[PDB]
UniProtKB/Swiss-Prot annotation:
Expression across tissues: Produced by several tissues and cell types and mainly found associated with lipid particles in the plasma, the interstitial fluid and lymph. Mainly synthesized by liver hepatocytes. Significant quantities are also produced in brain, mainly by astrocytes and glial cells in the cerebral cortex, but also by neurons in frontal cortex and hippocampus. It is also expressed by cells of the peripheral nervous system. Also expressed by adrenal gland, testis, ovary, skin, kidney, spleen and adipose tissue and macrophages in various tissues.
Modified residues (Phosphoserine): 108
Gene transcribed to yield this protein: APOE
Miscellaneous comment in the UniProt entry for this protein: Binds to and activates LILRB4 on acute myeloid leukemia (AML) cells which leads to suppression of T cell proliferation and promotion of AML cell migration and infiltration.
Known glycosylation sites: 54
Protein name listed in UniProt: Apolipoprotein E
Subcellular location: Secreted; Secreted, Extracellular space; Secreted, Extracellular space, Extracellular matrix; Extracellular vesicle
Biological source species: Homo sapiens (Human)
Amino acid sequence: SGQRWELALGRFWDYLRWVQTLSEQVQEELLSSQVTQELRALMDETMKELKAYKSELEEQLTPVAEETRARLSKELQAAQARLGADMEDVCGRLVQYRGEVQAMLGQSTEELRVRLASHLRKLRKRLLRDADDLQKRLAVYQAG
């Protein structure tokens, strides 16, 4: 619904979609730490806005039993953690690539790139899946 945190995640997502192409410029920036640096910044902004959003949502809540409210807040916090961990996993996989290329000592990295692409697809599937769940939980959080 165009929340600030969603637009932030959208920018992280668009950038990652670009990285997935493994185009010439992506390949260049992947050997430097430019891609992981720009990706962590986008991840940080997303989590930052996410936290601020949750805090603001809690100003207009429907009153329920301390227990079910306490549970929904624990459930919401877990979904948040998952998202951050997903983004961290992506960054980590990209760091592994940088090192595997270096270890090749100049050899063709075409096979390494085929495998990186395959893996990134699965990691991105996981991230999208977790983002959707988090977004659904946030939508029904206030009603309790």
